[PDB]
Amino acid sequence: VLHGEGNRLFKLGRYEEASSKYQEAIICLRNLQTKEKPWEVQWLKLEKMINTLILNYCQCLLKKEEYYEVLEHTSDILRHHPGIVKAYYVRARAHAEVWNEAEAKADLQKVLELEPSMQKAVRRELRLLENRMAE
C-alpha cells in the first residue's frame, strides 16, 4: 500500500510525505530480504521492488535539491546492478544539477547505449546540463 500511497503523495507535490512512505516501504522490504538468501530468486524479486522505491525516493530528493544524496543512492544501486537504465538517468540528472558535467555526460551515454529510445530524453537532459554549465 505504501508504494502507491507514496506515488499519490508525490503527484500532489507532497515530497516529504511521499519520501516517508517510500522509506517505510524500503525498510520493510529490506527486512523481508534478511529472511532470504542474498542474490537468490526471492531476494532478487524483493530487490526489484526496493530499487523502484529507491528511485522514487530519489525523485523526492531531487525536488528537495538533495543532489549529493541522490548520487549516493543511485550509485549504490548501480554498484550492484550496472544495467539499470533508470538509475543512470536519475544519477545523470543529479550530476547535472551539481555541475558534474563529465559524470552527467557519461551516465547519459550509458542511458543511450542501454536504451536507444531514450535519445529524445537524453537530448533534453543535455540541454539542461548545458544551461547549468553556462555558469
Curated annotation (Swiss-Prot):
Q: Which disease is it linked to?
A: Leber congenital amaurosis 4: A severe dystrophy of the retina, typically becoming evident in the first years of life. Visual function is usually poor and often accompanied by nystagmus, sluggish or near-absent pupillary responses, photophobia, high hyperopia and keratoconus.
Entry function: May be important in protein trafficking and/or protein folding and stabilization.
| The TPR repeat ranges on this chain | 1-32, 51-84, 85-118
Q: Which gene encodes it?
A: AIPL1
Give compartment(s). Answer: Cytoplasm; Nucleus
Record protein name field:
Aryl-hydrocarbon-interacting protein-like 1
Q: What is the effect of changing G83S?
A: No interaction with NUB1
What is the reported tissue distribution? Answer: Highly expressed in retina. Specifically localized to the developing photoreceptor layer and within the photoreceptors of the adult retina.
Q: Write down the superkingdom of origin.
A: Eukaryota
Q: What is the effect of changing R123L?
A: Found in a patient with LCA4; there is no interaction with NUB1
What is the organism of origin for this protein? Answer: Homo sapiens
Biological classification of the source? Eukaryota, Metazoa, Chordata, Craniata, Vertebrata
Task: Outline the subunit composition.
Answer: Interacts with NUB1.
